[PDB]
Amino acid sequence: ASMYDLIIIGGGPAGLTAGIYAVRYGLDTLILERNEERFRTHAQEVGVKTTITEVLSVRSEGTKKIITTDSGDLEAKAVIIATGANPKHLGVPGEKELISKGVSYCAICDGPFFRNKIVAVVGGGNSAVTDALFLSKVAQKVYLVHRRDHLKAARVLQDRVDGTPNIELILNSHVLEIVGTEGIKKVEKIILEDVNSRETRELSTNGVFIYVGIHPNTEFVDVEKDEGGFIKTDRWMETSEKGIYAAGDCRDTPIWQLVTAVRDGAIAATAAYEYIEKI
Amino acid sequence: ASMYDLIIIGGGPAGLTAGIYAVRYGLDTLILERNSISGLELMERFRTHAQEVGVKTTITEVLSVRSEGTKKIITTDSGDLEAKAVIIATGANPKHLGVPGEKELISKGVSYCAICDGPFFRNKIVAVVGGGNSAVTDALFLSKVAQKVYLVHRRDHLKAARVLQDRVDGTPNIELILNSHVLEIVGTREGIKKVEKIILEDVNSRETRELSTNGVFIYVGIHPNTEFVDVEKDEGGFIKTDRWMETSEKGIYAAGDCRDTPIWQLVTAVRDGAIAATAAYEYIEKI
């Protein structure tokens, strides 16, 4: 093979939707997935080709796109970036180890588990503060920990945080380690350090929620992006390089706007179709 | 018992999510029911997941909701219900044209989502009824795959943004038909039952015109199912809320499309339901 009409990078909701549409449009398409819902099986049924590999780079020459993977170079007329995004990590001991065992990056998903429990939120932006306020509705107490001398969130949210009794705001503080229990292995405490006095502090917590930014997986593409790595596109998901599109969390969308992976995927596939049938 | 902690009106994604969360919060909750576009069975999963969780569902019709000292009275055709908190999750539906053949040919050529049905109308003829950003955007969308697109609007000009109108201007395979009103959608007499034609009428000259079309996409507004509640709304009838999904009535919340919401996507609906349940929980405990 080697040559294809369309190559979709990412096997998330955006990519899978793009693949299904493209196949129904009758395009020769391949999805590149880094590792293995129903969506997946559903896609396979439609007749999507998927290959477990990793993309290292993507270059465009003469109306052709060169995708270099560990398996070898691949060629395509059009490309869809659907690589999503990941939460930025604290990079401290116990974070990766206690994930799904007290450490989390979604406060709304784990709300009920921490009812009447003690909880810590790390971050200073609207996300950290919003979810600290959220968790305060259900948790006994919430520690909001930030490394700077002030919060970066909007004044309106900061005022609400001051308002709430059961939120304790700890500024000028950075996390040294998340320590867990004696089975079951779950979060038990966190060690803090004052950024100025180097003084240590131990806080008993049942959970730790981390909100220190989001990282879009777009380092391998050289299209136009915003300050943060999110790919800029038009209403048809087209990037700054004609023939290349982007869909899902890896794309540059306004804050108020939440996930629209399926819509982005659907549109990206038909915009690509229009592009292919013209070349 | 006629008394509950929380009552959720609507068994959609938002309501079912709210119910699941609420049960996990340990509240006595009941759902009132009447009776993802990639094509999947995810709605039933919510119900099963729900049943397993332990949420209560009853089939009934709600007529009104009034507050009487932090107590919420839900009056149904079956009788009055009592609750400490209420969540409105009744969703919304696209407005219909109200012409012959529309209801009969739904899922057989008539649709309200062009993005959902894109691949089916590849190399086919298509008609879009409407004049707003949605109708024009989806007309442009369909022109990328369809042979021909009729963009039909009843007014003398389009209400959509200029950038979208300029695009519609060429784009050779879109024909813009203004001052035009749909009289009927007619289906095939022979063969598989599908849309075959649409009858148009010029609003000014009363001249009629037949158009052969394989599909009709309708965009003439969205209707939130919120006439049975007397909380604060916009001219839409969309229920106004704060960040925590709370309505103008303390103790009453709203989630999903029935609410005044930036996005109508499923994830948002689930998110609204989750948040609404925890906001209600906080309200119930505090009092």
Author numbering:
A (entry chain C): 2 to 37, 64 to 208, 210 to 307
B (entry chain A): 2 to 36, 56 to 307
What does the paper say about this structure?
Based on phylogenetics, protein structure, and molecular mechanism, two groups of NTRs are recognized: (i) Bacteria, plants, lower eukaryotes, and archaea contain low-molecular weight (LMW)-NTRs of about 35 kDa with a non-covalently bound flavin adenine dinucleotide (FAD) cofactor. These enzymes accept reducing equivalents from NADPH and transfer them to a redox-active disulfide motif (CxxC) that subsequently reduces Trx to its sulfhydryl form in a dithiol–disulfide exchange reaction.
The X-ray structure shows that MmNTR is a homodimer, in agreement with the gel filtration data, with a structural organization that is analogous to other LMW-NTRs. The redox motif CxxC (residues 132–136) is located on helix- α3 within the NADPH domain, with the two Cys forming a disulfide bridge in the crystal. Remarkably, no electron density of FAD or any other molecule was found at the presumed cofactor-binding pocket. The MmNTR structure thus represents the apo-form of the flavoprotein. The NADPH-binding domain is positioned in an orientation with respect to the FAD-binding domain that exposes the NADPH-binding site to the bulk solvent and approaches the CxxC motif over the re-face of the isoalloxazine ring of the presumed flavin cofactor. This arrangement corresponds to the flavin-oxidizing (FO) conformation of NTRs that allows for the interaction of the disulfide bridge of the CxxC motif with the isoalloxazine ring of the flavin in a conformation competent for the reduction of the disulfide. By contrast, the FAD-binding domains slide up to the dimer interface of MmNTR with the consequent loss of α-helix contacts. Subsequently, the two domains in MmNTR are differently positioned each to the other with respect to canonical NTRs. This modification is likely a consequence of the loss of FAD, which results in the structural destabilization of the region comprising residues 36 to 68 that disrupts the dimer interface.
